[PDB]
Design a protein around this nucleic acid. Structure first.
Ligand SMILES: Cc1cn([C@H]2CC[C@@H](COP(=O)(O)OP(=O)(O)OP(=O)(O)O)O2)c(=O)[nH]c1=O
Ligand SMILES: OC[C@H]1O[C@@](CO)(O[C@H]2O[C@H](CO)[C@@H](O)[C@H](O)[C@H]2O)[C@@H](O)[C@@H]1O
Ligand SMILES: [Mg+2]
Length: 580
DNA sequence: CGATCACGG
DNA sequence: ACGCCGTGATCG
């Protein structure tokens, strides 16, 4: 169609109205220190394209960007706010984010550009980003006339789409979810990303050297026990060595061949001691490629900071994800890998890392939603839920529960409600299927409210076509009412899990908002560095630690009010490792 | 490029 | 058929 706009040479007053759609275009997927390629503004007065050299050097435009009373509608304002922070420019007054609006309406659409959001409301006057920029190796900023139209069309779409999106969100009881939760969170995340996390690169390099030496050792020992050289990192080549050369029993097959999973290898340990060396090599290899080589590749060598990106509009359940680097999967469960955490350090001298974590938040959320008398009682009385379950499924008194029995009970606790089978429980814990089935019966008899939640939540999903979380986030499950046992089954387990995992996401998000408010309120230097699903990581001057110790846990625990209390553990020290 | 494997929640 | 949600390295 025909859409008129001003390809402007200079900023003018009518471009600085107090309500506008604004596009600050960053074409690099990773927007940290990335170029801004163009600016579009659409308001009551018209449509404008501005060259970034010009607009970002203009004191009036920069003031307008920074003024919170001048309201902007955008798509992915976090991308813009961060790219602008790298250029030394503050962005304020973002009142609508089309990306977050589309995400809330349906995460399954995987909306990742203005065009994809526009399609939800049959708005077609805008091209997909991939069509304008090209895919893969063809990725390129087009000629200025083409770029300018594309950006103005994006700004025009946001301008037209705000009301229809807000109208549907309001209808879904998700309007406060957008304006009071996700949008404020976006600003908090932008600050966390830009600040970054400081890394001890010398320590990482030292670990890397040693690891390469252990790797070399374990590798040769594997070749020696196998009587051949092969690529150990090739599950397929490893399959041949284990199941053809060594004639080890084939315990599991996939559509592609023999499994060499950690679980299969565990079950093969009575047969040959090689499998235990292979497990060791894989643990070492992971630390090396992922957490040494990977981290050092992205660290900024002049500041020693890593700058992750929290994807706020990706997961189906309302969790965040973290990329380039992922800081939500740094090792903790085994002591060797946990030491990577010593390389995560305060950004200034005399600062400390502070870490706080919800205790068993998903099971507390389950207690609340299911209204199981027995489960609710456990949390109100501050009992250990994993020990209690152990007592119920092993039919023993409390003192008889072993640390191993607690671990098995933890697997039961995080498995049954989400649809684990007796088979799955038997395979995962390497125990008899008959006993696994008894565990499952005893659990349900001990927590009958949980059995009824599973039945009721699946019924609700079938009747409504979606499930909802505590703060009204939705996930649609069109696959749920199918005759196809597998497709229906996978959808049923999503119905069981999403309300629990998604409600836990809602609670921590609200917690981050409340916390930001107070830190700023009491004018502390403390700020957030990271969120890890049910944990918050901060850094602060050491003097601030007696305050954080009282403030952080309280904000966290009172974020929402449930039919059971929420519990938070917290720790500080001179590295992330030490914050335990 | 989709599976496999390992790491976290 | 066989708990859920993620990212990265690596393979063929
Ligand atoms: C280990 C593991 C964990 N999870 C999720 C669900 C919980 C969170 C946090 O794990 P944690 O051991 O702290 O659990 P928590 O209940 O906090 O137990 P602790 O009191 O920390 O022992 O991770 C899981 O889904 N499957 C697993 O096998
Ligand atoms: O800016 C993050 C935001 O952008 C999207 C696309 O709209 O994802 C892009 O950026 C991510 C972070 O660099 C990449 O991981 C992703 O591959 C890229 O498409 C959204 O998905 C995201 O919320
Ligand atoms: Mg825990």
């Amino acid at each position: 169609a025909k859409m008129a706009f001003t390809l402007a040479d200079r900023v003018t007053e009518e471009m600085l109205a107090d309500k506008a759609a604004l596009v600050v275009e960053v074409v690099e997927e990773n927007y940290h220190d990335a170029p801004i390629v163009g600016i579009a503004v659409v308001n009551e007065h018209g449509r404008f394209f501005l060259r970034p050299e010009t607009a970002l050097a203009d004191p009036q435009f920069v003031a307008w960007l920074g003024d919170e009373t001048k309201k902007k509608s955008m798509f992915d304002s976090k991308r813009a706010a961060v790219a602008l922070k790298w250029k030394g420019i503050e962005l304020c007054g973002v009142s609508f984010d089309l990306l977050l609006a589309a995400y809330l309406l349906d995460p399954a659409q995987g909306v990742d550009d203005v065009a994809a959001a526009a399609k939800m409301k049959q708005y077609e006057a805008v091209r997909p980003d991939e069509a304008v920029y090209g895919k893969g190796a063809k990725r390129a900023v087009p000629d200025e006339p083409v770029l300018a139209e594309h950006l103005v069309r994006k700004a025009a779409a946001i301008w037209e789409l705000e009301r229809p999106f807000l109208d549907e969100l309001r209808r879904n009881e998700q309007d406060r979810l957008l304006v009071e939760l996700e949008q404020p969170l976006s600003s908090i995340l932008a600050e966390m990303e830009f600040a970054g996390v400081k890394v001890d690169t010398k320590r990482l390099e030292q670990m890397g050297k040693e690891l390469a030496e252990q790797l070399g050792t374990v590798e040769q020992r594997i070749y020696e026990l196998a009587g051949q050289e092969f690529n150990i990192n090739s599950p397929k080549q490893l399959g041949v060595i284990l199941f053809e050369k060594l004639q080890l029993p084939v315990l599991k097959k996939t559509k592609t061949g023999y499994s060499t999973s950690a679980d299969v290898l565990e079950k093969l340990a009575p047969y040959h001691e090689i499998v235990e060396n292979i497990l060791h090599y894989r643990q070492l290899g992971k630390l090396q490629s992922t957490y040494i080589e990977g981290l050092l590749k992205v660290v900024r060598p002049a500041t020693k900071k890593v700058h992750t990106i929290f994807n706020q509009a990706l997961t189906q359940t309302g969790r965040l994800s973290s990329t380039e680097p992922n800081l939500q999967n740094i090792p903790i469960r085994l002591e060797e890998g946990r030491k990577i955490r010593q390389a995560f350090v305060p950004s200034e001298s005399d600062w400390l890392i502070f870490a706080a974590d919800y205790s068993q938040i998903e099971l507390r959320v389950l207690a609340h939603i299911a209204e199981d008398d027995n489960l609710m009682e456990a949390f109100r009385r501050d009992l250990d839920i994993h020990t209690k379950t152990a007592m119920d499924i092993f039919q023993v008194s409390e003192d008889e529960v072993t640390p191993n029995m607690r671990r098995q009970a933890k697997a039961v606790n995080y498995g049954i409600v989400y649809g684990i089978s007796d088979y799955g429980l038997a395979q995962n814990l390497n125990i008899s299927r008959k006993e696994a089935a008894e565990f499952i019966e005893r659990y349900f008899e001990s927590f009958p409210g949980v059995k009824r939640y599973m039945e009721n939540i699946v019924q609700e999903a079938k009747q409504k076509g979606y499930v909802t979380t505590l703060l009204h986030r939705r996930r649609y499950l069109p696959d749920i009412t199918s005759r196809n046992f597998n497709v229906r089954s996978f959808a049923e387990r999503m119905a069981m899990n999403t309300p629990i995992q998604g409600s836990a996401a809602d609670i921590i998000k609200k917690a981050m908002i409340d916390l930001n408010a107070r830190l700023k309120e009491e004018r502390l230097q403390a700020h957030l560095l990271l969120q890890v699903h049910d944990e918050l990581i901060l850094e602060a001057p050491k003097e601030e630690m007696e305050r954080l110790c009282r403030l952080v846990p309280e904000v966290m625990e009172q974020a929402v009010t449930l039919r059971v209390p929420l519990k938070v553990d917290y720790h500080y020290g001179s590295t992330w490792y030490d914050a335990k």
